Design a protein around this ligand. Structure first.
Ligand code: SF4
Ligand code: SF4
Ligand code: FES
Ligand SMILES: [K+]
Ligand SMILES: [Zn+2]
Lengths: 125, 86, 48, 688, 206, 95, 114
């Protein structure tokens, strides 16, 4: 037998996260930009959630990068921004949502390289 | 102790800012000539409810809502501020 | 090694060392990279 | 109606005529492998990696170049297609050098990745390999040309995007070599983009060489502040250190390019940094101190002054959060002398109307214009990506460009009307023949450079230019809601400061010299101690010790744009925000927090304690400042043009000369680039 | 073909036939049935059907899955019901395996399957411990693997790898104490995924 | 190529050395700073340039499969030598 | 918006369980202090119990309340059966943790975190 619940889903109290790492964090919800060094687009399909970057300092002994941020490496993956937003809301994180950038359709014509009277004519091949 | 700056916020297309848009189109130039060295910062932004901000000496501020105001009410709200000294 | 001597190299230690832990010859770790950020040094003369 | 039906592995897709096979595949989420093809360059068709079988056709077609025909079924995964890819990959790797461990491309290499995904897993090449000699094309791009695969992307980018026809191919066949033939340096403000578009490690970043591998870098999406274009970037960091800057695609701003200053000046962030608060000692020398002590000294002076006795100057890299915090603090002592370094005429409407000081047409709108008039600007060096958008329209739309000012090389041919400001009056009056071009244009665009407004007759020039833009709009020669008047800014902080109500230029300070002066990253030297009373108390807040710092009484180390989440408004009026890539060094602090902390110690606590609260404050002052990535249109050009006429200024006889006439002037313009050893190498390279 | 795993069509057909058999007999609960290309049969069910479906497979004469090989959970944060509950069962009579899957979220109890398999006792305690899925009517549900008083469910995808707290002996209080985690060397995140698609057969529609 | 600083600390081949006011050099008090004294930059410079009769030469570092991946070095320029990117050996086209 | 309950069908039923759990914890503190030979007082232990309950006073979802009670009962069981050691009980008090400053200025002086 089911019951009726109208409260906004909030699980912050039963996840065990320290209060500091709920209230003071800013989740970033976005589709990663294509790495400009490569033409492949397979890393731009899904939505990601990452958190604000915090201090890294040099370990006195070795010079290694030390951190006190337990979420420094946390990156979550989502099928849609709605799924990402829903996950952020129920976990109590404030977030920013960046709309997906999709390359616009380009008009390509190999023949334009040899135009009779247009600047598109290429001087070399 | 008096006025330091006026700011007018409005939307470019929403009907609620229609009276403010008329005021700017028809009255801002005359108002600017009268108050030449008073900053009247008009800042349009889509889908904001119109508002009139007044900043007085030492950083005190007041805001009056202009939603669904006529161009005349906008004039009146402007005069209520150009003579107030909060 | 008396029948199959090792290959000689200029850089190979000619003098083997045993475990030096606990002695003044012990290894002490440290960062081998130089300072990453240079601070601005204010002028040595007055002008305020 | 117009669309035709094709099939991608049996899946129907409707595409416009002229769509290539490769573009049709990308409509159903299939990325055809490629090397020579780049969607922003002209089609080449030489690598042959894109060969794909068309059902019932015996010959594979180059998908990047072949227009799709109605009813074609493109088999992107057939055995014929796979064997074609394997064969081409085999030829590509036959002479390629076994360089991956020493090659900086390794780990983000399209040759490696497409070899893994589409090539065979072994070699049957039993011969010796080709070896090619390396070319020296300057201090930014390292060439290891044995790795080149002759894709000609670099050649096409240099010719079409950068408008520089220096790269080509010499020789023939297997010995064909990409280069300059002669010893020659590829110094263009967009040169570094060939590193990105080169699919292999043939062209690599010299400053970046050997320092990192792609998999270990952290990517922070951020914004550029080297100019006012607002190019989107990615800051690569590793273990708390900035390693390089990369373009981040944004179709309406920089596309996928960045200027060389944006790309290579980041090394200035590791030099001459302000890491500790400093105060003058009894001997008159700057000495390190605590935050408590430095702010107590500043708060003490602030409490003892009021009104005109306190002033502030904002520099070119200051963010909006700091700009409004400082404005609020000075307002609480009843000061309104909040100034910027970049002048803008306050005559008429001044900064009351946003349309007065914005690039109203937007950057993307240049692709719609049919005539562009440039006045008193060198956009190539003031806004390299804006100038690249003009060239793109010049190349593809046959745009007509006219210029008033010095005949600088713009990488495209334009009509030079002269450098005399009188030409504006002649054009406005119909005497000049080019006024007929503006009348017959359906979408004219008049762009006045902010550098021209730094003259003493700036108001007159702005009035004259606005008069021209008004003659066209009033004449109904244009279309619907097409904005004609434009201001091209070159300073990252300028538009946000104008939105917030700052006073453009330091004229107010020269009128009423203050007793206390805040230099918020102000490093242009517009106001020196010669212009201030003898006992003036100067506070410098910034991230670099450059011009302002050595004359201050108190130094407050702030954060650079890589070290804070801060708001910048580009020349269009688009608000964008950076993200923290690394934290500020030493004891440096976020710039708005310094002012918020100072306000508390001085008894005038500001009403915001967090980044989101200070951003709510920005919305109170200017709602558009929190609409990130949005371009809020500005209207009322007609009211502004009315106020422009009622007061008359005279043009000076000086010709319009931009501050940057040659590439040597491009590299060092702010405190970060002045501190960059890479930019110094660029400056030396082009002057020697 | 020496390097390619050989297919087994006969086992694929048998498992497919049995998968329909189960779906026909328990339509009330079965939502999806699939057989993988390496011949493993999965029954996806509504969570209400855990006990009836598991009981049927254990007891029915043509099933006889008498052994619960394993019981575990998978966290998929993008799903409304983030937790997938996986039962792996073995039939000695018919020398076969079957996988039964259901779902739940952070607040919806699942019926404990201890009545069907006594093996489920500790597996469900581990699922509660590591994922925070509550099982109703469990004889003794409590943490099993984590420290006493440990806060959180480590195997959730949003729980950080190194946790939130770390331990050391403090001489002043003469005991082991827990303090917020600080690492001398931060774990170095690597971005390994190639920007190029590897497996066309699994491409998702745009 | 070990050189010492004014404080006396040996300078490593990566140029590392603690500066005068650096507290971190307290770690060496009563112990020692481990420094390798066979500087590879000085050792490779002692190797003679190899004269060859072709425009292109291949290097695998010596030892066949015990060396490094085999690379081909172009020797067309006469201003400088061809240097192996892996092992630092130098080559020159004779005459 | 129709969901399967855990134990409670509404907040009133849920709050009964909360009160019952609080009574059990309240009565257990004196035994815990003696059994674990704690140096805190019975009042401190009960003040800590109240503080732990009070921080969840804003919950209005009966399913969340049920889980909090479920987890609270598990924690109580670990204490009564002495599965916890002294270190585990004393972790509630953060004795070795230095006072984290709260006001804007204090945080500004020490670092960058908000
Ligand atoms: S360009 Fe790519 S394939 Fe060629 S050596 Fe460099 S990493 Fe290897
Ligand atoms: S240098 Fe790079 S971009 Fe230019 S042709 Fe060679 S592989 Fe292509
Ligand atoms: S991508 Fe089509 S031939 Fe190169
Ligand atoms: K490259
Ligand atoms: Zn070698």
């Amino acid at each position: 037998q089911l019951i009726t619940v109208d409260e906004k889903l909030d699980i912050t109290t039963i996840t065990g996260v320290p209060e500091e790492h709920i209230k003071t964090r800013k989740a970033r919800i976005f589709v990663p930009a294509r790495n400009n060094m490569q033409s492949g687009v397979n890393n731009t399909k899904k939505w990601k959630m990452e958190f604000d970057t915090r201090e890294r300092w040099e370990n006195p002994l070795m010079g290694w990068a030390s951190t006190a941020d337990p979420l420094s490496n946390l990156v979550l993956t989502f099928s849609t921004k709605e799924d990402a937003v829903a996950f952020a809301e129920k976990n109590g994180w404030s977030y920013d949502v960046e709309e997906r950038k999709v390359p616009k359709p380009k008009s390509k014509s190999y023949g334009a390289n040899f135009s009779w009277n247009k600047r598109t004519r290429v001087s070399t091949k | 102790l008096g006025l330091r700056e006026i700011r007018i916020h409005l939307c470019q297309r929403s009907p609620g800012s229609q009276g403010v848009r008329d005021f700017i189109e028809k009255r801002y130039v005359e108002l600017k000539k009268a108050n030449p060295d008073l900053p009247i910062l008009i800042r349009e932004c889509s889908d904001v409810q119109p508002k009139l901000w007044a900043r007085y000496a030492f950083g005190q501020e007041k805001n009056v809502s202009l939603n669904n105001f006529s161009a005349d009410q906008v004039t009146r709200a402007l005069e209520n501020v150009l003579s107030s000294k909060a | 090694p008396t029948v199959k001597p090792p290959t000689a190299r200029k850089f190979i230690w000619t003098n083997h060392k045993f475990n030096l832990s606990g002695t003044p010859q012990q290894y002490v770790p440290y960062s081998t990279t130089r300072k990453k950020i240079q601070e601005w040094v204010p002028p040595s003369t007055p002008y305020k | 109606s117009n669309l035709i039906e094709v099939f991608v592995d049996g899946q129907s897709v409707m595409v416009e005529p002229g769509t290539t096979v490769l573009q049709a595949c990308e409509k159903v989420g299939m990325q055809i492998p490629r090397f020579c093809y780049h969607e922003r360059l002209s089609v080449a068709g030489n690598c042959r990696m894109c060969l794909v079988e068309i059902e019932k056709a015996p010959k594979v077609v180059a998908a990047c170049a072949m227009p799709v025909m109605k009813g074609w079924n493109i088999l992107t995964n057939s055995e014929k297609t796979k064997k074609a890819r394997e064969g081409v990959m085999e030829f590509l790797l036959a002479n390629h050098p076994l360089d991956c461990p020493i090659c900086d491309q390794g780990g983000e290499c399209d040759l490696q990745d497409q070899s893994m995904m589409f090539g065979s897993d072994r070699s049957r090449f039993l011969e010796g390999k080709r070896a090619v000699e390396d070319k020296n094309i300057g201090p930014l791009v390292k060439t290891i040309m044995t790795r080149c695969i002759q894709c000609t992307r670099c050649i096409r980018f240099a010719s079409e995007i950068a408008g520089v026809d220096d790269l080509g191919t010499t020789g023939r066949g297997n010995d064909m070599q990409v280069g300059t033939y002669i010893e020659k340096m590829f110094m263009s403000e967009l040169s570094g983009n060939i590193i990105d578009i080169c699919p292999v490690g043939a062209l690599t970043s010299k400053p970046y060489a050997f320092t990192a591998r792609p998999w270990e870098t952290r990517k922070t999406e951020s914004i550029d502040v080297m100019d006012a274009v607002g190019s989107n970037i990615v800051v690569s960091t590793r273990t708390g250190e900035v390693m390089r800057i990369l373009p981040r695609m944004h179709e309406d701003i920089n596309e996928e390019w960045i200027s060389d200053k944006t790309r290579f000046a980041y090394d200035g962030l590791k030099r001459q940094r302000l890491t500790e608060p400093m105060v003058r000692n009894e001997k008159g020398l700057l000495t390190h101190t605590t935050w408590e002590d430095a702010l107590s000294r500043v708060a003490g002076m602030l409490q003892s002054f009021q009104g005109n006795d306190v002033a502030a100057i904002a520099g070119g890299l200051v963010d909006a959060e700091a700009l409004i915090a400082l404005k609020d603090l000075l307002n609480r002592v009843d000061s309104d002398t909040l100034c910027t370094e970049e002048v803008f005429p306050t005559a008429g409407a001044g900064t009351d109307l946003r349309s007065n000081y914005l690039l109203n047409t937007t950057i993307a709108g240049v692709e719609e214009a049919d005539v562009v008039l440039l006045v008193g600007t060198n956009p190539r060096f003031e806004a390299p990506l804006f100038n690249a958008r003009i060239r793109k329209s010049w190349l593809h739309n046959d745009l007509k460009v006219a210029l008033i000012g010095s005949p600088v090389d713009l990488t495209y041919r334009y009509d030079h009307l002269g450098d005399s400001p009188k030409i504006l009056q002649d054009i406005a009056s119909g005497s000049h023949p080019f006024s007929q071009v503006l009348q017959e244009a359906k979408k004219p665009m008049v762009i006045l450079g902010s550098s021209a407004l730094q003259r003493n007759d700036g108001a007159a020039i702005l009035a004259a230019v606005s008069n021209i833009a008004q003659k066209i709009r009033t004449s109904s020669g244009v279309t619907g809601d097409w904005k004609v008047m434009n201001i091209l800014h070159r300073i990252a902080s300028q538009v946000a400061a104008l939105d917030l109500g700052y006073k453009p230029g330091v004229e107010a300070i020269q009128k009423n010299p203050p007793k206390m002066l805040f230099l918020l990253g102000a490093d242009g030297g517009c106001i020196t101690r010669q212009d201030l009373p003898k006992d003036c108390f100067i506070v410098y807040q910034g991230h670099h010790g450059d011009v302002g710092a050595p004359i201050a009484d108190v130094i407050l180390p702030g954060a650079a744009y890589t070290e804070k989440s801060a708001t910048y408004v580009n020349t269009e009026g688009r608000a964008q925000q950076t993200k923290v890539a690394v934290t500020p060094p030493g004891l440096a602090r976020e710039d708005w927090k310094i002012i918020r902390a100072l306000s508390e110690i001085a008894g005038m606590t500001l009403p915001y304690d967090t980044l989101d609260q200070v951003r709510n404050r920005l919305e109170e002052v200017s709602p558009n400042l929190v609409r990130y990535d949005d371009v809020e249109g500005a209207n009322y050009f007609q009211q502004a043009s009315e106020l422009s006429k009622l007061v008359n200024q005279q043009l000076l006889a000086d010709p319009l000369v931009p501050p940057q006439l040659t590439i040597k002037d491009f590299y060092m313009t702010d405190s970060i680039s002045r501190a960059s050893q890479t930019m110094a190498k660029c400056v030396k390279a082009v002057t020697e | 073909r020496p390097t390619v795993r050989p297919r087994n069509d006969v086992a694929h057909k048998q498992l497919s036939a049995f998968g329909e058999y189960v779906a026909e007999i328990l339509p009330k609960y079965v939502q999806q049935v699939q057989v993988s290309c390496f011949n493993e049969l999965e029954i996806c069910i509504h969570p209400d059907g855990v006990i009836p479906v598991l009981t049927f497979l254990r007891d029915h004469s043509n099933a006889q899955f008498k052994s619960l090989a394993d019981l575990t959970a998978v966290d998929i944060p993008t799903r409304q019901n983030r937790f997938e509950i996986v039962y792996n069962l073995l039939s000695l009579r018919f020398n076969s395996r079957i996988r039964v899957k259901t779902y739940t979220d952070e607040l919806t109890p699942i019926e404990s399957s201890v009545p069907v398999y006594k093996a489920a006792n500790w597996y469900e305690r581990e699922i509660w411990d590591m994922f925070g899925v509550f099982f109703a009517n469990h004889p003794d549900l409590r943490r099993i693997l984590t420290d006493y008083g440990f806060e959180g469910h480590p195997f959730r995808k949003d729980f950080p790898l190194s946790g939130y707290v770390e331990l050391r002996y403090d001489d002043e209080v003469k005991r082991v104490v827990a303090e917020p985690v600080e690492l001398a060397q931060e774990f170095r995140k690597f971005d390994l995924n190639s920007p190029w698609e590897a497996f066309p057969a699994y491409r998702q529609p745009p | 190529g070990v050189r010492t600083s004014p404080t006396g600390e040996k300078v490593t081949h990566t140029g590392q050395v603690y500066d005068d006011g650096d507290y971190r050099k307290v770690r060496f008090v009563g112990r020692q700073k481990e420094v390798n004294e066979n500087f590879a930059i000085d050792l490779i410079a002692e190797q003679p340039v190899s004269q060859v009769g072709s425009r292109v030469i291949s290097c695998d570092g010596g030892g066949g499969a015990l060396g490094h991946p085999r690379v081909y070095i172009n020797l067309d320029k006469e201003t400088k030598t061809g240097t192996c990117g892996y092992c630092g050996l130098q080559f020159r086209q004779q005459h | 918006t129709s969901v399967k309950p855990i134990f409670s069908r509404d907040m009133n039923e849920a709050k009964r369980r909360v009160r019952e759990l609080y009574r059990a914890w309240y009565r257990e503190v004196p035994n815990t202090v003696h059994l674990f030979q704690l140096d805190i007082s019975v009042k401190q232990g009960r003040d800590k119990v109240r503080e732990m309950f009070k921080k969840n006073a804003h919950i209005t979802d009966p399913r969340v309340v049920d889980l909090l009670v479920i987890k609270g009962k598990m924690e109580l069981e670990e204490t009564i059966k002495v599965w916890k050691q002294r270190t585990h009980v004393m972790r509630f008090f953060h004795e070795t943790e230095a006072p984290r400053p709260k006001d804007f200025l204090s945080k500004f002086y020490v670092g960058h975190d908000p």
